[PDB]
Amino acid sequence: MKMLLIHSDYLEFEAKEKTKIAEETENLKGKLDECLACFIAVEREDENNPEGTAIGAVEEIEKVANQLKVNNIVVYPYAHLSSDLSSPETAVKVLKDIESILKERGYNVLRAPFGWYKAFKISCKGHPLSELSRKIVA
Amino acid sequence: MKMLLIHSDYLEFEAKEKTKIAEETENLKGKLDECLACFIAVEREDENNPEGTAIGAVEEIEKVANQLKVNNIVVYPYAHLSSDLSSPETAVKVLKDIESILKERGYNVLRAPFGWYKAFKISCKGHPLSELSRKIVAK
Ligand SMILES: Nc1ncnc2c1ncn2[C@@H]1O[C@H](CO)[C@@H](NC(=O)[C@@H](N)CO)[C@H]1O
Ligand SMILES: Nc1ncnc2c1ncn2[C@@H]1O[C@H](CO)[C@@H](NC(=O)[C@@H](N)CO)[C@H]1O
Ligand SMILES: [Cl-]
Ligand SMILES: [Mg+2]
Numbered sequence: 001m002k003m004l005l006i007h008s009d010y011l012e013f014e015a016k017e018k019t020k021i022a023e024e025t026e027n028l029k030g031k032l033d034e035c036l037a038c039f040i041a042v043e044r045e046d047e048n049n050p051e052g053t054a055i056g057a058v059e060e061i062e063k064v065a066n067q068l069k070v071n072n073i074v075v076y077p078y079a080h081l082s083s084d085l086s087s088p089e090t091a092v093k094v095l096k097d098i099e100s101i102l103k104e105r106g107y108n109v110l111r112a113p114f115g116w117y118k119a120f121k122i123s124c125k126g127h128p129l130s131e132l133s134r135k136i137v138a
Numbered sequence: 139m140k141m142l143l144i145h146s147d148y149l150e151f152e153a154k155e156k157t158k159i160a161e162e163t164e165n166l167k168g169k170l171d172e173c174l175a176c177f178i179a180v181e182r183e184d185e186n187n188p189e190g191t192a193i194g195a196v197e198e199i200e201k202v203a204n205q206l207k208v209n210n211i212v213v214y215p216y217a218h219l220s221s222d223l224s225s226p227e228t229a230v231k232v233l234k235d236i237e238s239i240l241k242e243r244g245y246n247v248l249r250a251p252f253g254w255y256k257a258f259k260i261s262c263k264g265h266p267l268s269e270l271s272r273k274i275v276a277k
Binding site: 118120132135 | 142152154217219221255256257258259261262263264266269270271273
């Protein structure tokens with residue numbers, strides 16, 4: 001799994017174009033202020049252990065989110081972070097689990113929909129811990 | 139080299155804090171509209187051929203910019219795209235070369251400062267060619 005975590009003034013997105021793997025969700029458009037935007041590519045190795053991957057990913061997000069005193073999290077599928085992707089069924093499973101576990105831990109989570117081409121706007125705060133890269137190996 | 143190309147309504151940045159490897163510059167704030175924002179990690183393999191790498195990079199930028207009818211290009215140093223980075227000296231050499239080559243080919247380029255912490259803002263247009271990853275192996 002590869003993740004880029006961006007401490008943002010806001011993240012706004014709008015689903016524009018369907019792909020063959022687009023999921024119809026209740027958040028085709030969405031916005032979250034004062035948030036950690038987590039851009040996530042689910043990778044082929046993740047298929048070995050989808051559940052452990054989600055757990056590892058949540059541990060890293062919470063480390064960052066707690067250091068920054070941030071409760072708003074956007075889980076944003078971002079397949080461009082890796083050229084070794086998992087299958088779509090595994091990827092959906094892992095993204096929804098990261099969301100589900102974060103909500104159980106009291107975070108305010110907005111999941112952007114899987115399998116769409118989307119427009120987005122972001123403003124990255126630019127302090128020393130505002131942009132962080134994490135590689136998760138379960 | 140790893141590149142992530144994003145077709146944007148705009149890209150803005152402001153340098154905030156100097157890292158220990160910051161490039162000396164006066165270009166500390168900048169904005170470019172209707173651009174292809176090119177986030178670039180220069181990798182250690184690029185050390186064997188910095189010239190071919192910049193040429194390889196520009197070739198890929200050109201193919202996208204021509205498809206999308208874009209003339210405005212941001213060259214934005216982005217180490218997080220790769221876990222196997224080049225030296226900072228090689229990275230700047232390559233990024234500068236990318237800019238100068240694009241400039242010779244008629245593109246307008248904004249180059250974001252290397253080794254500074256920057257605030258930034260981007261609006262990605264959201265279509266199938268609006269975000270592209272490219273791996274450049276130099277010829
Ligand atoms: N292994 C994977 N990890 C994360 N995301 C994945 C994926 N496989 C497919 N996707 C999703 O399908 C859209 C098209 O590839 C991807 N779309 C995107 O990454 C958008 N940023 C484009 O605007 C994403 O929703
Ligand atoms: N091989 C390389 N390729 C591209 N950029 C590189 C580099 N080595 C160092 N940098 C730059 O130094 C900052 C601190 O690592 C890097 N900073 C950044 O990538 C910010 N966007 C996130 O901190 C970047 O400016
Ligand atoms: Cl979804
Ligand atoms: Mg738009």
